[PDB]
Amino acid sequence: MQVRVTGILIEDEKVLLVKQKVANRDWSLPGGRVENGETLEEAMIREMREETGLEVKIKKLLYVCDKPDASPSLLHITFLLERINPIHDVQMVPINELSYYGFSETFINLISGGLANAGSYQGL
Amino acid sequence: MQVRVTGILIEDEKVLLVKQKVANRDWSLPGGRVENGETLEEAMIREMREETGLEVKIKKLLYVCDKPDASPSLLHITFLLERIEPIHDVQMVPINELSYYGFSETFINLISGGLANAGSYQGLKRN
Ligand SMILES: [Cl-]
């Protein structure tokens, strides 16, 4: 089973986005695959470092999404993060404008709520 | 990877405990291994009706504990459950009495905080 973590870092009502180095290379949430021997947290911290060069700490686990029909089975965990050698592609997008970046027709309010939505789950 | 789900169904400040058909028996939380192809949810619902015969729905993810160093790697998810629509060994124990059944004060506080502690996480590695 594969596991992926993504971080949501909010400051002044904006979310941190990075340019994806794969696919259509759109601005998306920072994250990556959890590597063998890594706790979800170590992976999150490593991914933030490699894609934004920032040092962070887990604030809370917000939303977990699992799709076992994937190949291989996939578990997706999203963390609320707080801030504490290539130049990184980074952008702070106002939460309002997130819809202009193609963000899900099912959420955006999920992150608007912040801690209020901690622990959300889906299963599909 | 081995994934385990645990259910915490609270009603009137009491937690649902089940009696283990293994080891020294003893009252513990309902849960089990997530079987291949199941979503965490499908497994939670399945374990819940095999051990308590109740129909439940997930409220929120309460706690995620992962031990990548375990053999095999372990991910343990705890769900706050809510009731919806063979005889099982079931008991509703008041939360302020869980210490009697071996639960630590730390855990009792977690369950006690309820929805307020939703989304808790902890990574555990040896050394
Ligand atoms: Cl690897």
Side-chain angles (χ1 to χ4, degrees):
Chain A
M1 170 170 251
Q2 185 182 66
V3 187
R4 283 171 170 281
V5 293
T6 56
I8 288 174
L9 179 57
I10 300 175
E11 293 192 5
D12 296 340
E13 298 191 299
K14 298 179 193 172
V15 182
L16 180 338
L17 262 40
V18 295
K19 222 192 182 73
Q20 212 159 51
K21 298 179 63 181
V22 68
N24 192 55
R25 320 203 191 194
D26 299 319
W27 286 98
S28 60
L29 289 172
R33 181 177 67 87
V34 176
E35 280 165 37
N36 189 281
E38 294 189 307
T39 58
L40 301 187
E41 170 170 48
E42 294 175 312
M44 186 70 273
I45 279 61
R46 175 178 55 62
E47 286 294 323
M48 280 307 90
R49 277 165 183 172
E50 314 182 325
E51 308 178 315
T52 75
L54 297 170
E55 286 299 306
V56 303
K57 74 180 180 180
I58 303 295
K59 203 176 176 187
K60 269 210 183 309
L61 178 161
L62 176 121
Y63 202 73
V64 48
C65 162
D66 86 298
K67 40 192 63 176
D69 290 310
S71 180
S73 285
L74 184 273
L75 206 308
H76 207 295
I77 301 88
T78 298
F79 285 113
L80 243 299
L81 302 173
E82 188 181 300
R83 185 162 56 123
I84 54 180
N85 197 61
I87 294 171
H88 309 292
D89 294 339
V90 175
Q91 188 183 353
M92 294 301 288
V93 175
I95 294 173
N96 296 161
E97 301 176 38
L98 243 22
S99 31
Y100 306 145
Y101 290 80
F103 274 85
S104 299
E105 167 64 297
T106 41
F107 94 106
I108 275 187
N109 291 62
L110 178 69
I111 76 174
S112 300
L115 294 178
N117 300 202
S120 297
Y121 170 83
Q122 47 62 270
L124 195 163
Chain B
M1 270 229 112
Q2 172 181 59
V3 188
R4 285 176 173 288
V5 290
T6 287
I8 289 189
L9 197 179
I10 301 166
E11 282 186 20
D12 311 312
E13 299 171 297
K14 299 174 185 179
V15 186
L16 178 339
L17 296 190
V18 150
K19 191 83 114 60
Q20 295 179 298
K21 304 179 66 178
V22 296
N24 297 55
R25 301 133 62 182
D26 249 317
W27 297 92
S28 51
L29 294 164
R33 235 227 324 152
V34 174
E35 308 184 315
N36 189 285
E38 296 184 307
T39 56
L40 300 183
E41 187 182 3
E42 303 177 310
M44 187 70 271
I45 272 58
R46 173 177 56 60
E47 287 288 326
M48 219 49 203
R49 51 202 182 193
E50 306 188 321
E51 301 179 303
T52 82
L54 298 179
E55 282 303 304
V56 305
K57 78 179 175 182
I58 292 187
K59 286 245 292 294
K60 270 187 170 195
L61 199 322
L62 173 71
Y63 188 81
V64 174
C65 174
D66 76 307
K67 286 184 178 180
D69 297 316
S71 298
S73 282
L74 165 63
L75 187 59
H76 187 192
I77 295 84
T78 287
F79 288 117
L80 278 180
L81 298 171
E82 180 168 291
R83 245 206 306 169
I84 58 175
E85 299 308 305
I87 303 171
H88 308 289
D89 294 332
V90 177
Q91 183 188 178
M92 294 300 297
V93 175
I95 296 168
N96 58 57
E97 291 186 62
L98 271 345
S99 51
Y100 177 84
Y101 293 99
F103 298 83
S104 66
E105 288 309 309
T106 283
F107 189 53
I108 291 170
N109 292 332
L110 180 74
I111 282 171
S112 179
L115 241 53
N117 297 327
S120 292
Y121 164 82
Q122 185 182 306
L124 297 168
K125 294 183 63 62
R126 270 293 247 101
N127 315 315

